[PDB]
Write a protein that binds this DNA or RNA. Structure first.
Lengths: 243, 49, 54, 389, 33, 57, 102, 96, 46
RNA sequence: CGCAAGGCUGAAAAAUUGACGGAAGGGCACCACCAGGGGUGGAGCCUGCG
């Protein structure tokens, strides 16, 4: 199994065995320490938990459940302690997603993104982006429909497009700490799959999120439409001949 | 119960305007990129210089 | 290089589709379709600018 | 809240050892006797502010009377660009108020012995009205020149290299009106963060004191003052040493806010005798009284007499820098390190440091004869947070 | 007064860096060229 | 301290710092004098007489 | 009149710009203020530092015209933002502080 | 180096750990200190994800690099007795 | 205000990063190429 | 690497050609006269500026 962030994990680290719940975060391209949602297969990601402090470059092992009825390979993760701190800087991407309302040549009005002109005035000048790749900038809050705004893009966007704003919301790890006092007895916090199978709730699945095959028709464009005054003003060697 | 419960709108990756409450952006502290140079406001040291 | 990458390094990243609540508006234009749209518009504007000069 | 201390003696040593060992302290009954100004002193509360600024996760709590604080320490981060400053090369500003009587080396000595055990660099910049860069009458604080070329070579002995220490003054100042005041700003940049200091060994006799070099500084007085001081100090030390050389330094005046005023008018001298053997240096300083107006030749003779006193007295390290070298020796690895103190060097501050280390959890010290060799067992803590790449 | 040290001793002592302790037309060919 | 370079200096007499050099006469200032009694509340006032036919309070 | 002409007339009235007087005219001046008036001159002849209306008051009431300084107000507001918003942006994630109850 | 074909070393510090682009050669290069002679030379880890197995103060075998920083001569072959390509291929665990 | 502060910080941070890594890559290339040319000279003399 | 990089010190002239005017006479101006026209200013809405 892969091992999710937020789900608890029994760390063997120092003399301590302790069950804590970590936060898995990649170091994006050495810029921001972006929070992942799973550990990557066959890749070292950073983790971050709330436990006792150990001098770094100290290796550790990491299990999921101390049970003999595991059919295969009880140890889950390995690694080494990188550093210790208080108040880590883990950061997760939050995308504010909106929809175009009226589309002019460059300035488009974008509707289903904010709720009020106060929120737009906070996010004034922000780098807004289309799914297609068109960049743009939030210019001005719009008055009459409350929650819409004017954003001047790079080129003309389409009504089918989706207009995103990629903010970075900080995520703090939880401060949970079980000691794995095995000779006395201890309560072991379960995993999310065991919780869902026990208390009978299905896993959340979005149909807009599940990948599909996209049927793209071949893009054919209209021919050139020359205006009448220009087509009547240009000279004889380059005059348009249409029967 | 926290692990099994629904994610907050800040922890969902795509937060459209139907999910969150009304003025819920003002309570958050996010960083984001801006576009273009701002105009320099004329301050008294600038006018003196 | 190219031998220093696993098959999971080589594995393709899939493209998301238009949401089903919004599929009536057409296809979700991504970078490839946007490149086609921009090429056609720049070509038509180049012909129109040459016709205006002439 | 857990560990319990009393009194206002060795207050900064107690807070710094609490930060370094991670042991939460509770210091009670600061000024029980004083009815006029009970509670914490302004330099003490400004050191609390500086400790909160450079650490992270430390919780300091001063009581309503001001006579009891408690302190749960955190990690010494330094100037990280996410928590403490905006850029990694940015100097963390610290302002200390105008009602400050102690010198700036009262803040620099605990910060310099707490700085090699940090995570990032330390880039502290002491500005404000009450920043006196001189010696004080006070509790006889060291000057900036005395502090620099008398105690930072001891970090050079421990393996915290002084190639990366950058202590620079931008204005210099004495006390001024009474003991309060200042004005001269400094900045200290520790860029040399070590895991564990080396277990050093000061055992061989530092016999031949080869040379004397020094600094005579004047801020706000005529520049012939340091020349007269050099002639006085040379008239005393030319009976003993052929090469005494004392630099002369002069600054016009520092200005503080009230509309600015010029404060910190004074002059002082700071001699450093270098022994030919190893990193062994004896220092002495003397400053003019901030209202008195005494003779500069009196000051030069006074600092030369103090230097000959420290040369007569000291085994290897003087008692001004003995707590710093002993607490770094305690922070080193789990071996013994051997310092050679003089029998006259042992002081109540040094003894109180020994009591504080025994209370905190470091091992005791072994004292044998050779002046006495004191041998300290390291505790092997080092610095807690450092990004092992 | 003989307290004026030297530029080298000023460079070690009065700088920001603290002093570490672990130091102690001949010929016609050339003229034509 | 009244000099022949057409100014007077005020020194503090602890550390002897010049309080303010003040150029006040058009010619070489001959003499200066304090009023001795601070019984009237003005003992830090002084007169200065110069070759340009002026006294200045 | 012009701003140049009124500036010259006010400086001739304050005696800062007039003809080169002889030693006898300086004797008359030493026989027989101006910074307090020069402050008013340097405030009046640089009227763009402060915001004024042109019309004057709409309804005259008699009971016993600089209406705002935008330069000074913008600098003051930027100092307030330097003291609060930039400091919070620096200490985004900084836990614990000195709890001063006195 | 020396007279041998492979040298051993201590990884002093992974220089270029804060480089931006992933397969930069400044990201891949590692400053090591050879045991036999004592000098600090620089060596290439063969891959940026393979850099994560190289920890500080680990005994590292290194060989020549025979073919963005032209002139770094060595490449890291084994780390703590286990071959680095085997660690990258997830054949062996690293004994620490 | 947040726009001006973030743009100033981004310019200063990018300039400091570019300067530091130009220094690091230049020093590494200098030392390694010096030792490589010395070894090629000592090998060509054999 | 070397020089720059040592404090009679302590914040706020030029002129044989220059400084300032006056009187007379010209030229121009919907920031002037003359002839008219039109805003704003009264009530409500709101961007912006203070």
């Amino acid at each position: 199994k892969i091992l999710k962030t937020g789900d608890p994990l029994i760390f063997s680290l120092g003399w301590r065995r302790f069950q804590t719940l970590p936060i898995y975060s990649i170091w994006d391209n050495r810029t921001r320490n972006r929070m992942l949602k799973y550990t990557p297969e066959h890749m070292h990601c950073f983790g971050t938990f709330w436990g006792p402090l150990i001098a770094p470059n100290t290796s550790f092992c990491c299990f999921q459940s101390f049970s003999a009825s595991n059919p295969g390979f009880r140890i889950a993760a390995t690694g080494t302690v990188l550093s210790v701190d208080e108040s880590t800087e883990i950061v997760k991407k939050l995308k504010l997603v909106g929809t175009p309302w009226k589309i002019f040549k460059n300035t488009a009005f974008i509707k289903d993104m904010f709720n009020s002109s106060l929120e737009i005035a906070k996010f004034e000048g922000a780098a807004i982006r289309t799914v297609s790749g068109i960049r743009g900038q939030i210019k001005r809050a719009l008055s009459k429909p409350e929650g819409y705004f004017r954003a001047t893009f790079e080129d003309k966007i389409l009504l089918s497009d989706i207009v995103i704003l990629k903010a970075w919301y900080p995520v703090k790890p939880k401060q949970f700490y079980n000691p794995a006092t095995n000779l006395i007895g201890w309560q072991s916090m379960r995993l999310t799959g065991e919780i869902r199978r026990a208390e009978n709730i299905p896993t959340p699945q979005n149909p807009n999120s599940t990948y599909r095959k996209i049927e793209r028709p071949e893009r054919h464009f209209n021919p050139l439409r020359v205006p009448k005054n220009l087509a009547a003003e240009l000279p004889f060697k380059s005059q348009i001949v249409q029967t | 119960a926290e692990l099994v419960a629904k994610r907050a709108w800040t922890l969902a990756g795509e937060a459209t305007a139907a999910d969150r409450p009304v003025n819920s952006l003002l309570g958050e502290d996010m960083e984001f990129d801006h576009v273009g140079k701002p105009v320099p406001v004329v301050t008294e040291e600038v006018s003196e210089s | 290089m190219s031998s220093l990458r696993h098959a999971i390094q080589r594995r393709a990243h899939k493209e998301r589709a238009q949401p089903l609540e919004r599929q009536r508006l057409g296809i979700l234009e991504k970078k490839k379709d946007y490149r086609l749209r921009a090429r056609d518009y720049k070509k038509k504007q180049a012909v129109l600018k040459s016709l205006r000069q002439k | 809240e857990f560990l319990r201390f009393t009194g206002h003696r060795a207050f900064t040593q107690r807070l710094v050892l609490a930060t370094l060992y991670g042991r939460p302290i509770h210091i009670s009954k600061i000024r029980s006797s004083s009815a006029t100004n009970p509670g914490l002193a302004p330099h003490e509360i400004s050191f609390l502010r500086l400790l909160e600024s450079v650490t992270n996760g430390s919780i300091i709590d001063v009581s309503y009377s001001g006579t009891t604080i408690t302190y749960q320490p955190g990690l010494i981060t330094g100037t990280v660009p996410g928590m403490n400053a905006s850029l990694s090369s940015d100097a963390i500003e610290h302002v200390i108020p105008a009602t400050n009587t102690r010198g700036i080396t009262y803040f620099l000595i605990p910060l310099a012995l707490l700085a090699p055990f940090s995570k990032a660099h330390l880039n502290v910049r002491f500005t404000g009205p009450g920043v006196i860069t001189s010696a004080t009458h006070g509790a006889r604080d060291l000057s900036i020149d005395t502090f620099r070329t008398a105690v930072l070579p001891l970090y050079g002995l421990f393996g915290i290299p002084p190639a990366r220490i950058e202590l620079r003054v931008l204005q210099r100042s004495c006390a001024g009106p009474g003991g309060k005041g200042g004005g001269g700003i400094v900045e200290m940049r520790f860029a040399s963060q070590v895991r564990l200091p080396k277990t050093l060994h000061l055992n061989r006799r530092p016999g031949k004191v080869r040379r004397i070099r020094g600094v005579a500084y004047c801020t706000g007085v005529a520049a012939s003052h340091n020349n007269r001081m050099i002639t006085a100090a040379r008239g005393v030390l030319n009976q003993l040493v052929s090469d005494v050389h004392i630099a002369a330094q002069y600054d016009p005046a520092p200005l503080v806010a009230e509309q600015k005023k010029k404060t910190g008018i004074g002059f002082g001298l700071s001699l450093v005798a270098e022994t030919s053997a190893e990193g062994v240096i004896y220092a002495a300083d003397e400053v003019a009284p901030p209202e008195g107006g005494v003779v500069p030749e009196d000051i030069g003779e006074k600092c030369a007499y103090q230097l000959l006193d420290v040369i007569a007295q000291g085994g290897c390290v003087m008692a001004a820098s003995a707590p710093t070298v002993l607490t770094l020796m305690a922070m080193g690895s789990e071996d013994v390190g051997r310092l050679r103190l003089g029998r006259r060097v042992v002081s109540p501050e040094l003894l109180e440091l020994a009591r504080d280390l025994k209370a905190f959890g470091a091992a005791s010290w072994g004292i044998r004869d050779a002046d006495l060799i004191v041998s300290v067992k390291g505790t092997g803590v080092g610095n807690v947070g450092r990004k092992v790449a | 007064a003989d307290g004026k040290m030297s530029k080298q001793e000023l460079k070690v002592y009065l700088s920001s860096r603290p002093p570490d302790p672990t130091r102690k037309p001949e010929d016609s060919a050339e003229l034509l060229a | 301290t009244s000099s022949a370079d057409k100014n007077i200096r005020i020194w503090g007499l602890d550390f002897g710092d010049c309080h303010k050099a003040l150029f006040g006469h058009q010619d070489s200032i001959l003499q200066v004098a304090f009023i001795p009694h601070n019984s009237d509340g003005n003992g830090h006032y002084f007169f200065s007489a110069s070759k340009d036919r002026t006294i200045k309070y | 009149g012009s701003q140049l002409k009124r500036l010259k007339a006010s400086l001739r009235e304050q005696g800062l710009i007039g003809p080169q007087k002889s030693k006898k005219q300086k004797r008359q001046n030493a026989n027989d203020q101006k910074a307090e008036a020069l402050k008013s001159i340097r405030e009046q002849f640089n009227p763009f530092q402060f915001k004024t209306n042109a019309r004057g008051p709409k309804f005259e009431v008699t009971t016993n015209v600089i209406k705002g300084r935008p330069e000074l107000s913008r600098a003051r507001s930027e100092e307030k933002r330097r003291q609060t918003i930039l400091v919070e942006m620096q200490r985004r994630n900084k836990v614990g502080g000195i709890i001063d109850r006195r | 180096f020396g007279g041998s074909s492979h040298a051993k070393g201590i990884v002093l510090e992974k220089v270029g750990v804060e480089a931006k682009q992933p397969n930069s050669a400044i990201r891949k290069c590692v400053r090591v200190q050879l045991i036999k002679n004592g000098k600090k030379v620089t060596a290439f880890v063969p891959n940026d994800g393979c850099l994560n197995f190289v920890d500080e103060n680990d005994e590292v075998l290194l060989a020549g690099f025979g073919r963005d920083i032209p002139g770094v001569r060595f490449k890291v072959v084994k780390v703590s007795g286990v071959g680095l390509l085997a660690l990258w291929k997830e054949k062996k665990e690293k004994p620490r | 205000f947040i726009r001006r502060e973030q743009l100033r910080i981004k310019k200063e941070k990018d300039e400091a990063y570019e300067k530091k890594f130009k220094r690091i890559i230049a020093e590494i290339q200098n030392e390694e190429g010096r030792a490589a040319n010395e070894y090629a000279r000592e090998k060509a003399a054999r």
